[model samples]
Target chain A: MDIKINDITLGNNSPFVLFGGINVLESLDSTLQTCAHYVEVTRKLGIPYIFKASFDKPRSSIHSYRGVGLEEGLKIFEKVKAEFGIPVITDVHEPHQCQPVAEVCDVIQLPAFLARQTDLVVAMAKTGNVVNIKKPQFLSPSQMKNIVEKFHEAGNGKLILCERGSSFGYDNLVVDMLGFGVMKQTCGNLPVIFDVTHSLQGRRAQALDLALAGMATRLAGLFLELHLLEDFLIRIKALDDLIKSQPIL
Target chain B: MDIKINDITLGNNSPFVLFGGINVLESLDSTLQTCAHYVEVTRKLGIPYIFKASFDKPRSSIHSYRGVGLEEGLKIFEKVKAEFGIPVITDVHEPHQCQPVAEVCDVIQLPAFLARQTDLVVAMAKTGNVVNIKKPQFLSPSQMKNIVEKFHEAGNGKLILCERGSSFGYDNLVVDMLGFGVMKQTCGNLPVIFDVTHSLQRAQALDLALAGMATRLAGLFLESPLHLLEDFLIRIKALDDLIKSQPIL
Candidate 1:
């Protein structure tokens, strides 16, 4: 039900945590600046927060920029954790990368594409650190149990299920609002966090609306990358607080 | 590019093939009876034909009927092919299942959920049987190139991409009409097909099927108990015929 990432509590019933940061770790200076802003905004709004970014920056195109690789990325993540004293989360691509990533990151994400890779799942689970399994774009929320069971079987129960978005068609992602509840119900009410940033891959204009819709499903947290941090958080934090305060009927 | 299944030519520019059959092999009599109807309707309209059904009806619930399963199901398929003298298609859920299914099936389908499973993809590829890769409800049309490439890399290029609808939110599917074109352009102009019955899982069937065919596809996959098959095919075949008649601008 509840997963503790240091002092932060994450559960579907709890006030939503903010897993917000840059899309990729561009540079140490930029990563810290972006993370510092997230910490400031989240703290001011009294929303629990975790910093998230992908050091690997996996892309469909080989020509695209991959973020600062593991070694440098971990050093930057370490800097963010020490500087902000908030939990940090980043995705892992391979089985071999899990341990080193887990050591530096409070929560290591199982990338959506690699969600069902058993070896990676086992390696991530073995870290004994909080794991965020990004619901694969091609997997139904109900199918998530297979991945969760893999983690539990691999000797870890401290898992967080993250819904980024499902492929709607081409060049678009749609956050299934009802999917948040389905993942929650189907996966034993584990902390279901939504990556609203990725969900808005093609629809940034509807960011706040989509974020509210997901949180209204009684989510554990909102995962995002934002341009207008304070402006967006003011409304999101309000909705999250209101939704989390209501008694489940 | 067109894929040849026996004498049948499946190309986006060619007349649409009808890959129609029961959802599962309920019984030999029922399977034959169903295939007979599809054959009769398609023959009367002169549409290309391929019989399809799954030997393994993989399900979310364990209690649901999983068809007759591999051995018995394949025997039933053998009978259908023998009786009808038409190309047959059936889905394979595992690597070991691919070869045997391919031996009897003219077209071997890569289940949507297992679309990206490398072992299954390679196994299906090695069989040299025509493959209908069901577009996962959670995968984008462009992303299909990855699956298509996997098939190619495994030494098989005879592939058909299928759209069975993508997850809209939950318990619903929406067929992005544009996805057909995107798949055509993205996957080396490979033949793309529409699974109308599954797409209708969440439409008044005709409208959606027509809409998808209008966008240009090689075939229409259906699993409806249509006492209305003749009339339905009348409209679908007309549209497919008209669409194929016109030149792409």
Candidate 2:
């Protein structure tokens, strides 16, 4: 099955498109407002946009930083979808949260930690919503095939695989370029996304290394999370320049 | 130059052995006692022991559980060396800490976050102690070659490369088996160690969905931290089973 987010069509023949800019509900109004601006900027830059946010930061060390609980966060997401007139995606933590979250977002994300939840995957699939499964940091690309299979079992063929970054050392992460190719071959025509922002954060040494190291590897699409109103605009601009100057054959 | 921590000789012609364990503190009598017992058991099993501990838990969210201040911690380590007569390895965060820490420890470890700190690498090298440079999660195995070169520039050939795990997603890590071969090729004859316990913690996912999908690939290594004497013994047994079951070839 094919998956389309806004103007971009994801399947066999499309050029890799990137979706960028995601922030939680700590500053919901500003976050969505900035997201709308990013969508416009990306559209102008000829890049597709997929609104990304997380309702629950389950792996967070301090639980307080999680989005404005679930209810308020979902309401804001609904507005982002309706106001922005764009496709939206948010992460789901529990199996019970699948139906309610899928109601508002275009894509249901299985966080890396929860990438192996069978019941959660099935529940998300039952909604017949587009599913984007991130490869758990502990897992290799070849191993993600089974994750894709589970989505198929959920009776939903619209699936996407996201490669954020792999864990390298203690509290560190590494992005493997070959993982994209490996996932592509394993999933066979399923859209594969290279999450550049998350990958850059994983690379950061002090507090989110900003370098985009794995972009050299070809991918079906790119997923980026940025803050246009903040210093992220400058960072994203720098990233865009780097990507533009790359020798893509 | 060759470094032997028990029967495992790391350097030309030797299979780079990986070591893993918890960060034990000198102030914690229970922890130190447990660590000494682990060394005894691992030694009996013919597994080379490189007493691993973090003098400063830099990544701790709150400083409460951080190590028993550096000086006291080093004192405890000195005692461990004197009593057990085994080489000890510890991590260092700053350049100044290198010389003092190196005076007591056999190897000074460069944390993954600070792996790219040229000054720290040079300072550690000047101490004439074995430096185990952890491969940063953000960098590819090939990038690690330059890091090793930095140590070589400091006129120190006594260096080791460690792969903890790469970042797969936010707050998750994935162990790249190919990195074992890659680091071996890049570092030439430098001793390579696989941090089994640290790798396991990073690769082990909390999210059940991703875990279910990648259980097969996760079988690469089975190691965990030892908080108690019994846990250490169990870990040793697991390591033995792993070594016996899998032939490096």
Candidate 3:
């Protein structure tokens, strides 16, 4: 929760930090490719960027390419550590998986759909790892209170929230509070977080536009978050153009 | 609450009841038209109907025609009672207004927006009028616990909940479960009523929602393969027969 990680206290008191990287550990080469690239890009931006990746990828479909299994992924992660050694964050699904993942990943995460699983939470808590809880699309922001209590009760308080929109209808997914754009009309003076990668799942380009527009309109905090893309390509041109498009708020 | 309105049994084990009527006593002629139409339709439909209206509809524009003044409307309501001998409910907006309105009306309503106003609730309570508290759109059904406490704390606990669509987006509204359906979802079996246009529309929507909920909830017990359930039944019979042989029962 504090701006403290990797034996470094970032900024004088940095508020919003950058969290970017590949989505899933597709392969050792792809994982290293993106991690090294993100560290460099964020370094140029002077944004305190933390590289995120997931050894396990549970998409909606059963047959999707998940990842190299945790054992293999851990070996790959060891390679990345041997090179980049940036503060890395990755999530887990089952409770038994947490401690092992925590040994390699700097911060352990709880998956969105599995966020409420008590056993998974307890295991994650026991790792003494900073936890990133994906806001489950099934409930709203205030419901986060109950989630926090589960973690706190399990004896872990170091946590961060990542928003990935919500199901407004069976069809529309709005990044909930901010991307749904209703908050702008409601009133002001609150920090809004964005989870750009998962927020793009269905919306794609539309998601990026809304995220930028939200920052531009002062509807959300410019300090944003990202994740390891399950289907990430190191798209240097697009990233440069997208950053160049922004005018300092 | 107890589901008794005007000392008559209303909810479960009773049956679906009708709640009808005009917005307020606008004109003697229009009032007659509405009540007379409802009496015919409900009779044909073989449903029990409760008539509801309001003396002061402050929600409408100030320049627009409000209710025929409370005192005058009370008399018109009296006339409706005398002529048709039909049960009727009307809401009061002011603390000073409940008693006079209560003397004639079958039940007194509390508006959705003002359901929490302390003075308004106390007056409605003190009169000992069977109350229909409009479920506020701004809150959830469980949130109604506090409102119930407020009414109960005021000494008059006889109350009913009515639902109007909650504010969905900037302006879009739906008879979403979060308001009406949710009040039922989060509560026990009994539910609510709503105002403005088609008491019929909400009832129909509610009927559909109830059917959907019943199907979905009961659907949980449905076996995926149908034989899955049949398999269980077969096992149950075999186990029961063998157990009977042992005289364990």
Candidate 4:
């Protein structure tokens, strides 16, 4: 049940693979610049990098800002992969988007809102691409078992399960410690990545202090979206180092 | 402390404003179509509409679909307002986006993610726009007092407080009846809206049975979102009629 993404292997016996920041596709110019920086940083740190961005922002409030259209976005992704020689990952909203984006991206991601879209899952799987399915905030871990099966049925076997946070209320989210174990068990042998940055977002301050303190206790591997600001990244790096020094279990 | 969006005035003595049926925005054409449908239906029913959409959906998984760009997205919203002649309401992400979007929108909404952004509150209020602040799932009704005062200091008296639900556990949202009274007391003289559609969104339930059943018990009247389906509206109408027939508490 071991899952491998390029040279990095993730499973029950592997050291937690840390996924670095996501470089949004700003413009062709900025996208290339950020991708170069990402490859340089990851290669130096000896960490695996998965380039991530949304291909189509399906659930936008206003219609104006979606991804830079699928063709343009995927082209930028292709350039990143070709230039940096790093594996690329990006989200797919509809079933139709899987093949084209998968052609360019090493890994295909499923957006949370359409997590239950069986068609999209099948489409991604048929491509034989490494599919990373995000656990929807509205879904229980047990429900995710069905989603995993859909990916397998689609033909592709490489899969990663990401635990962001579950919907607590309208716009509030909460991460569950049990979710990590549940996802691991449900997808048997597939690598599980915990989204650290999104989990720390405090839209409203109910027990935020408590939640912030509890991150170390809940996570196995961390997935963060870093930027050039570097302060947040530095803080995360410190936390990552501390976590690595301790026995996570 | 009075906020008016169209004929509906949100305040201490006013009825709760209920808005619902927010499908994710897709293309500009589709977005306009959906918005127009919602506006027409709500107007026919004499229900005030709040154009609600997630600008940046935080509850989405780490590798999930989010919104379109902030700049272009605002333009689509403007079209909806200009064509329909209805005031528009949209969710806000960062503090700086408040004033610019507020110029085109009727009400500036505070997403649950940025609920605690004090600067965003002050900035939004200074624009002299009606502010609709959603209650964060983590905070209790009493905790909203601090959030209310931030707006009061901005010299923007028009404020509408909303109750979606509270975080019960992982992926579980619970509607605390006590929150209604708590929010009412915290921001006395301001209008309170009860988000019925969101309150009923049960975690991982495909049938929507739990959400359907929960709406009947919610007594808040200032603002609420309802299902657009005929049967759903009929049931709501029945509930409204039943409440009207009942003796005062």
Best by lDDT: 1
lDDT of 2 by residue, B1-249 (tens): 367654446553333233444564636565567667667666665555556676575432222356776888788888777777777778886677888898888878887756765657778889988778877664677777777777777788877777677765544567666776666666774655555445554223222212221211111112333444344434434543444456445
Model 1 chain B lowest lDDT segment of ten = B55-64
In DockQ, how does model 3 score against the reference complex? 0.02
Q: Write the per-residue lDDT of candidate 4 for residues B1-249, one digit (tens) a residue.
A: 556677666554433244542444445786776676666665666655556654444332323555665777678777776787766677775567877888887777886545665556767888898878888666678877778776776687777777777766555677776666666656674666666556654222212323332332222322223343434444454554455355545
For residue A236, what is the lDDT in candidate 4? 41
Best-first order by lDDT = 1, 2, 4, 3
Q: Worst lDDT window (10 residues) for model 4 chain A? A: A203-212
Q: Write the per-residue lDDT of candidate 3 for residues A77-148, one digit (tens) a residue.
A: 778877876777778876688988889887677777566456677789989987877766645566566667
lDDT of 1 at A156: 95
Using lDDT as the yardstick, the better of models 1 and 3 is 1
Note the Cα lDDT for every prediction shown: 0.82, 0.63, 0.58, 0.62
**DockQ of predicted candidate 1:** 0.11
lDDT of 3 by residue, B144-222 (tens): 7567666667787666766554445433445554444455454454435444232222334435334323211110001
Q: Report how far residue B150 has shifted in candidate 3, in Å.
A: 51
- For TM-score, candidate 2 versus 3, the one ahead is 2
Candidate 1 per-residue lDDT, tens place, A3-122, comes to 888898999888778887888887999888888787777787888888888887543233357667889999998888888888888888666888998889999888786664565777
Residue A219 local lDDT, model 3: 22
Off by over 4 Å in 4: A20-23, A61-64, A202-221, A226-249, B1-242, B245-249
Better of 1 and 3 by TM-score: 1
